[PDB]
Amino acid sequence: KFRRQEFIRYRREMLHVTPAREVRIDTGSPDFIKWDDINGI
Amino acid sequence: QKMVAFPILLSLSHLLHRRILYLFDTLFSTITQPDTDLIARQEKGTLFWDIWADFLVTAADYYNEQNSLIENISNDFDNLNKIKPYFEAYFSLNRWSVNQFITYQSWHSHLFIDYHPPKTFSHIPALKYNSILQQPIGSLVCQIYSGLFNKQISKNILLVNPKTTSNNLVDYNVLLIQALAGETEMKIITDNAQRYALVNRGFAIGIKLLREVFDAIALNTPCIFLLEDIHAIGERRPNGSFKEDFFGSQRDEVHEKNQVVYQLTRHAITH
Amino acid sequence: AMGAARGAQASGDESASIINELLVQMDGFEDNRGIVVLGATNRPGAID
Amino acid sequence: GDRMSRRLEDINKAERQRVWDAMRVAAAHRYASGQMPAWFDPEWLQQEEAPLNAMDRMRGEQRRIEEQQQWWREDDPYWPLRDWGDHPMRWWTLAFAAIMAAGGLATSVATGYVEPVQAGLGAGALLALAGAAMSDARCVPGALGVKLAWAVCALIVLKEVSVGWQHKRKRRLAASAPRLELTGLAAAALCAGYMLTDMSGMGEVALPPNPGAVFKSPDVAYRASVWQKWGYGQVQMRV
Amino acid sequence: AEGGVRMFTCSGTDFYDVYSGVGARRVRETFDRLRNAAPAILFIDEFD
Amino acid sequence: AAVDKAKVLEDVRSIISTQLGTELEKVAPEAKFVDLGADSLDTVEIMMALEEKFEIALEEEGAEKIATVQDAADMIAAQIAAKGN
Amino acid sequence: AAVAAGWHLASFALNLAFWGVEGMPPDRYWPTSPRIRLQIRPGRYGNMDGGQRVYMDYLARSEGVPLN
Amino acid sequence: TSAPFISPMTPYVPEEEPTRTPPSIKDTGTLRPASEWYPQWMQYRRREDNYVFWQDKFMRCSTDIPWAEKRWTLFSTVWYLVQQLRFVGTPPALRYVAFLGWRALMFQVYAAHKALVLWQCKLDAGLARIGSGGATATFSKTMALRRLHWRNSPLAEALYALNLYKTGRVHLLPPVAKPIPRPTFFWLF
Amino acid sequence: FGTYYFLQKLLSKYLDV
Amino acid sequence: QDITIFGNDFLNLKTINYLSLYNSKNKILLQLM
Amino acid sequence: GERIWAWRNRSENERWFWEVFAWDRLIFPILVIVAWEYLVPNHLVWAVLAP
Amino acid sequence: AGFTGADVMGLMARAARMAARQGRHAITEDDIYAAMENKTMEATLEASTAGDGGGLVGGEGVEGSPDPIPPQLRRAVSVYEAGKALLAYITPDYEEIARVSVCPLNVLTGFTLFVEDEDKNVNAILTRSELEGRMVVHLAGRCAE
Amino acid sequence: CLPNIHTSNILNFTKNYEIFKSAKDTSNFGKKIILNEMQNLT
């Protein structure tokens, strides 16, 4: 559904003639990146 | 004698369900016929173009910019029971019933998907003796049949086959994938990469048309997407010591050259 | 003249459209009973 | 490999056999109507195997047997489980035919009704004929015999449990209801015995193929033929 | 996560345009988009 | 067609120990069954436990002459090996 | 009345247990788009070049896109 | 002999097409259920030898079907409705619950059958004593394993019992049972 | 068994020539 | 010294590599015969 | 999934029969003719000629 | 050694595949080692067979490659690999053996997986002792056969 | 990968044979009844 929405949006704005996509920073997730999660730096 | 009625109840259940589906179908295909406006437009268009157009075409060729219009119109103006045949035949088909194979342009029409190719795994007996094809193809089939295919993460798979210099034009990659798409009754999309190997001015525009194709595929799921001859656009992008022998360029520091040499010998010998 | 390959003199607009139309008429929802398209050329390698 | 060699040997064996059988049939036909070249000996139609496969089998078997040798019957108790050449359910069929005939005649004489003897002797005749044909199970008649016997026993079971017998009417209404007694039970046991021993012959007689079976077949001529027969000869084969 | 700020992501070739100058306009757009949401981090993969 | 006879042997010995009730060090690859305490009616239940663990079927003619642990292991391995064909 | 409503409730619970398509394979007599099944496609008249525009917004309102 | 030309020492029995697909590869001969997905022997073989799993699936499902499982008869166009109900008209969740129940039941039944087989082994080992009158008390492990995998017809069991009762001779076994072919009648079934 | 085999073979050879 | 069989007589490059790299001398002499 | 695949490869004739042939070409024309002849008085124009 | 995060995630997916091929669901350690070996053998086998050539793989059925890999030709690979691993074990300071295999992916060779230390010669050093040891180890198989 | 099957001779024969057999049922066991009618003095 998400790709479909973006496609509709882009195609309307195109034939009617910013790529910045933000993703939030959650800290409780197991994906979370501890301050010194990285190594050897 | 209470159990002579089970087959008939099964029959009635099946027939009733299918009748409901078909009544949806017929109500849908009735209210989407052209109304009076479009029918009248068709009739008037045939009257003006199916007889009047070709006739004045014939007149034009016999006589061959508004002046020419006036000329030819003036010149050629100046000098110019539905059931009987079934009985005369004596006293003188719903293709979808037997052929459910379709080619369609889908979801944006204002891409040529093929629905249900008529192929099966019995068009390729060579798959029965190739022991390294059983697991990937078998996993794909058991996933598609169990309904779990519409929620898996999309995959990339590379099929290689030794060179084709045969007298025939048979290609077992395409045949194998169409057999996979026909055994399971899915829809398949095919496109050749050579159509995108066109660049001018140093703008490989083919690799953006390909983006438009890929993000369109992502809209028609579930589907198989075949893409042949990727080598046409996947070649090796552009060390040579002949510069420091004959041209004396020598634009690199001594430690960098030494490091390159060390890593090269170690790589050649021990990797 | 129409059956030129891709990368012909277009930008995906004219010759592309006529080739796609030839396809749709030969393949998509064909009712082509008895119809034969007897095309003619002299350098068959150039066809798309 | 030593695996594709086995597949190849089995393919050759099967193809040689199928061709020998087709020759035998076509030669029988051409001979029954005169046209045969007079060096032909009609005993060659009794060789079932094939000459080639027979020679291969003989050589292999003699090599094996050469290089490897570098009531009650006390001598062999399991004689009943030995391939004697007939159907296992062959004496039971004749026994049941005799029982049906005797019982039908006895009953219809003892009472006065004419249906018991007619049904009993009709079934007896049909079952004796089937048990005669069942004395060589490899032939085609050996299979049509089993089919005939199964049909007769099924009809007996049906008449017993759904219509009952005329000489078994009573005064009441639930006292005279069609129920399963001892004749129907024996016929049902016989039907089960035919099904669980061997009734697999003439398997090529069925309802003809659909346009649904040939949708994915690799043959255009065959698909066209089937579509033609079922009424779709004009549909377009975009395949 | 340690800047207490907002994170924004995109790719480099996203600014390459078959239309002239629309790369410049989208550069302007991204820049003002980030400007109005200050402070933040603007990370650009595919930078070369 | 190629079986890790070592794994099969370890699993055979563990099954035998758990069935009889003796400990795994006493079960040696050449130990007969008669001395480990086995009596006919239990050189059968051992066979059934073996089949149940390995999910295979034993060839009966050879299964009549099983008297040491190594024959059990070799029977099971020759069965597992001939599975595809 | 309790019995006569329990019948319908049982039917609704059964229809709930399905929940979707997971378990149903694809079928070739019943594709998901009725136009494939019914062989429907446009003709020569009734096709304006200014129609695709409104087409899009219909699409935009069906997929949920709130922009319009 | 009938053979005019060629006749080996054992007469040729005309073998016919098989009428049923073989047991899969995952099944055992007994009553206890299979393994949900992967068999246990798969763990003791080379990774490049375990391709027979998916090959067997391909063979039973698509490419080796004996033309006798594809006969259109009047019985099969009704069994079609039974099966289509089970596969398309019943939700997979209820089918899953029934699957679990049926598995548990089959495990209980297999346990019972194994108990009975061991009992039969004692009984016949006892009968061989009457038979020989004297010493013989053993039984045949071959017959135990053949009983567990359903490889004897009832007549073979009876004749074995009689042979035991009369002459001891515990090692004389009936030949083996052959598989039952698919029954066909006509357009009917 | 096969007691009339030879008789029937001879007869069919000699009669239908 | 099971079923009578015949050869196909064509030597690929794959076949030549196999025969020359992994078979003994007598096998190659049979091929030449 | 595997069981469904096996069953679908063995049941093509019955599938086509129940999907394309049972109602449309076996039961519907019989019902239609019997129903027409149930109504429609015992004339000839109505019993034979108009059908 | 020398891997990145992408390499580790790709290796874990490949290990899942290698665990499937043995009738298991959970990844063990030998499935990771088998993933490494399989990556390498795939890379070679795909570079040899490429046209009318071929001649290395041994299980495809076609004329060049037999089906069950005759046993006389398996004894030889076992001898080859035994000699090579024995020589690599008794040579001081050689890399260490992680896994020894016979005909992986049905190729008609052996394979020994050597793990080394990147903190001893940091992708750049090569003494003379190491080179002589490597020569001996590479000729060991021929000599043993 | 695929082993370049189309230039081979065992695979071509097995391929053609398997396809032909999978086309349509080819067993004719009921045509053999003519072999039981060669002697009839009618």
Whether chain E lies against chain D with 3 or more Cβ pairs closer than 8 A is no
- CA–CA dist B25, G34 (Å, integer): 8
Which of B106, B58, B102 has its CA nearest to residue B80?
Answer: B58
- Helix H or strand E segment including H124: helix H92-132
- CA–CA dist K7, K11 (Å, integer): 6
Contact B14/H84 with Cβ under 8 angstroms?
Answer: yes
Q: Do B97 and D234 touch (CB under 8 A)?
A: no
Which of F74, F85, F58 has its CA nearest to residue F3?
Answer: F74
Whether chain J lies against chain D with 3 or more Cβ pairs closer than 8 A is yes
Query: Which residues contact residue J8 at a Cβ distance below 8 angstroms, ignoring those fewer than 6 apart?
Result: L63, M9, M10
Chain D: list its partners (3+ Cβ pairs within 8 Å): B, C, H, J, K, L, M
What token pair was written down for L25?
Answer: 């669901």
- CA–CA dist J33, J11 (Å, integer): 14
Question: Does the CB of D41 have a partner CB in chain H at under 8 Å?
Answer: yes
Name the resolution in angstroms: 2.9
Residue type, B136: P
Which residue in H45, H55, H138 is closest to F3 by CB distance? H45
Contact L94/L120 with Cβ under 8 angstroms?
Answer: no
Q: Do K7 and H62 touch (CB under 8 A)?
A: no
Question: Does the CB of D73 have a partner CB in chain B at under 8 Å?
Answer: no
Chain I: list its partners (3+ Cβ pairs within 8 Å): M
What token pair was written down for M35?
Answer: 């072999």
Residue type, H136: T
Query: Which residues contact residue L36 at a Cβ distance below 8 angstroms, ignoring those fewer than 6 apart?
Result: L11, L113
Residues of L serving a catalytic function are 81
Place of tokens 């399905």: G18
Residue D136 backbone zone (phi > 0: left; psi -120 to 50: alpha; other: beta) = beta
Contact B29/G40 with Cβ under 8 angstroms?
Answer: yes
Which residue in B130, B266, B269 is closest to L60 by CB distance? B130
Which chain K residues contact residue G29 at CB under 8 A?
15, 19-20
DSSP state letters, chain F:
--B-HHHHHHHHHHHHHHHH---TTT--TT-BTTTTT--HHHHHHHHHHHHHHHT----HHHHTT--BHHHHHHHHHHHHHSS--
Question: Does the CB of K36 have a partner CB in chain D at under 8 Å?
Answer: no
- CA–CA dist A18, A8 (Å, integer): 16
Residue H186 backbone zone (phi > 0: left; psi -120 to 50: alpha; other: beta) = beta
- CA–CA dist F73, F82 (Å, integer): 14
Q: Which of H43, H141, H149 to mutate to test the interface with F (most CBs of F within 10 A)?
A: H141
Which of F72, F2, F76 has its CA nearest to residue F33?
Answer: F72
State the structure-solving technique: cryo-EM
Contact L8/L75 with Cβ under 8 angstroms?
Answer: no
Which residue in H28, H49, H144 is closest to F44 by CB distance? H144
Q: Please state the φ and ψ torsions of residue E2, each to the nearest 5 degrees.
A: -105, -5
Chain centre distance of CA K39:
21
Cβ-based neighbour number of residue H75 at 10 Å: 13
> Which pairs count as long-range contacts for D9-12, CB under 8 Å and 24+ apart, including other chains?
D9/J2, D9/J3, D9/J5, D11/M13, D11/M14, D11/M17, D12/J3, D12/J4, D12/J5
Question: Does the CB of H60 have a partner CB in chain K at under 8 Å?
Answer: yes
Place of tokens 């698909």: D223
Q: Which of H53, H65, H80 to mutate to test the interface with K (most CBs of K within 10 A)?
A: H80
Q: Please state the φ and ψ torsions of residue H18, each to the nearest 5 degrees.
A: -70, 150
Contact L13/B153 with Cβ under 8 angstroms?
Answer: no
Question: Does the CB of H159 have a partner CB in chain B at under 8 Å?
Answer: no
- CA–CA dist H67, M24 (Å, integer): 9
Contact F56/F79 with Cβ under 8 angstroms?
Answer: yes
> To 10 degrees, the CA torsion angle through H43, H46, H51, H57?
-20
- Helix H or strand E segment including E17: none
Chain H residue whose CA is closest to B132: H51
Chain centre distance of CA E44:
7
Which of H66, H73, H71 has its CA nearest to residue H17?
Answer: H66
∠G52-G57-G58 over CA atoms, to 5°?
90
Question: Does the CB of D207 have a partner CB in chain B at under 8 Å?
Answer: no
- CA–CA dist K48, K42 (Å, integer): 10
Which of K14, D211, K7 has its CA nearest to residue H78?
Answer: K14
Half-sphere exposure of D173 (CA within 13 A, CB side): 0
Chain G residue whose CA is closest to A3: G63
CA distance G4 to chain H (A): 23
- CA–CA dist B11, B17 (Å, integer): 10
Chain M: list its partners (3+ Cβ pairs within 8 Å): B, D, H, I, J, L
Which chain M residues contact residue L46 at CB under 8 A?
1
- CA–CA dist D167, D169 (Å, integer): 6
Which residue in B122, B128, B130 is closest to M2 by CB distance? B130
- Helix H or strand E segment including E43: strand E40-45
DSSP reduced 3-state for H117: helix
- CA–CA dist L85, L74 (Å, integer): 17
Distances (CA, A) of B55 to B60, B64, B73, B76, B77: 9, 14, 12, 10, 12
Q: Do H85 and B13 touch (CB under 8 A)?
A: yes
- CA–CA dist D104, D124 (Å, integer): 9
Q: At what angle do helices K2-9 and H76-88 cross, to 10 degrees?
A: 150
Which chain B residues contact residue M14 at CB under 8 A?
125, 129
Q: Over chain L, what HEC string results?
A: CCCCHHHHHHHHHHHHHHHHCCCCCCCCHHHHHHHHHHHHHHHHHHHHCCCCCCCCECCCCCCCCCCCCCCHHHHHHHHHHHHHHHHHHHCCCCCEEEEEEECHHHECCEEEEEECCCCCCCCCCCCHHHHHHHHHHHHHHHHHC
Which chain K residues contact residue B14 at CB under 8 A?
18
Q: Do M9 and J12 touch (CB under 8 A)?
A: no
What token pair was written down for J11?
Answer: 């030597």
Q: Which of M4, M5, M13, M21 to mutate to test the interface with B (most CBs of B within 10 A)?
A: M5
What token pair was written down for L62?
Answer: 């076609």
Contact B192/B228 with Cβ under 8 angstroms?
Answer: yes
Place of tokens 């009609």: D42
Question: Does the CB of A11 have a partner CB in chain G at under 8 Å?
Answer: yes
Half-sphere exposure of H106 (CA within 13 A, CB side): 12
Chain D residue whose CA is closest to B102: D238
Contact D84/H159 with Cβ under 8 angstroms?
Answer: no
Which chain H residues contact residue F2 at CB under 8 A?
45-46, 49
Q: Do B266 and L21 touch (CB under 8 A)?
A: no
Chain G residue whose CA is closest to A1: G63
CB neighbour class for A8 (10 Å; exposed up to 12, middle 13-18, buried from 19): buried
DSSP reduced 3-state for E33: helix
- CA–CA dist D49, D14 (Å, integer): 11
Place of tokens 């040491």: F68
Which of B102, B133, B124, B129 has its CA nearest to residue B115?
Answer: B102
Whether chain L lies against chain D with 3 or more Cβ pairs closer than 8 A is yes
- CA–CA dist H48, F84 (Å, integer): 12
Residue type, B164: T
Task: Name beta bridge partners: C43.
Answer: none
Q: At what angle do helices K2-9 and B134-145 cross, to 10 degrees?
A: 90
Whether chain E lies against chain L with 3 or more Cβ pairs closer than 8 A is no
Task: Name beta bridge partners: G49.
Answer: none
Which residue in L23, L24, L105 is closest to H48 by CB distance? L105
Which of K15, B224, K22, B104 has its CA nearest to residue G37?
Answer: B104
∠A22-A26-A28 over CA atoms, to 5°?
165
Which chain A residues contact residue G65 at CB under 8 A?
5, 8-9, 12
Q: Please state the φ and ψ torsions of residue G21, each to the nearest 5 degrees.
A: -125, -10
Task: Name beta bridge partners: H129.
Answer: none
- CA–CA dist B197, K40 (Å, integer): 72
CA distance G46 to chain B (A): 7
Residue type, B176: L
CA distance H61 to chain B (A): 10
Which chain A residues contact residue G59 at CB under 8 A?
8
Query: Which residues contact residue L7 at a Cβ distance below 8 angstroms, ignoring those fewer than 6 apart?
Result: none
Cβ-based neighbour number of residue E38 at 10 Å: 8
What token pair was written down for A27?
Answer: 């800290």
Task: Name beta bridge partners: L115.
Answer: L96
CB neighbour class for B29 (10 Å; exposed up to 12, middle 13-18, buried from 19): middle
Which of D96, D197, D191, D99 has its CA nearest to residue D151?
Answer: D191
Contact F48/F58 with Cβ under 8 angstroms?
Answer: no
Q: Over chain B, what HEC string results?
A: CCCCCHHHHHHHHHHHHHHHHHHHHHHHHHHCCCCHHHHHHHHHHHHHHHHHHHHHHHHHHHHCCHHHHHHHHHHHHHHCCCCCHHHHHHHCCCHHHCCCCEEECCCCCCCCEEECCCCCHHHCHHHHCCCCCHHHHHHHHHHHHCCHHHHCCCCCCCCCCCCCCCCCCCCHHHHHHHHHHHHCCCEEEEEEHHHHCCCECCECCHHHHHHHHHHHHCCCCCCEEEEECHHHHCCCCCCCCHHHHHCCCCCCCHHHHHHHHHHHHHHHHHC
For chain H, the first-to-last Cα distance in angstroms comes to: 37
DSSP reduced 3-state for D148: helix
Give break positions in chain D: residue before each, C–N beyond 2.5 Å.
70
Distances (CA, A) of H3 to D86, D105, I9, I12: 20, 47, 14, 18
Half-sphere exposure of D85 (CA within 13 A, CB side): 8
Q: Please state the φ and ψ torsions of residue D140, each to the nearest 5 degrees.
A: -80, -45
Contact A8/G63 with Cβ under 8 angstroms?
Answer: yes
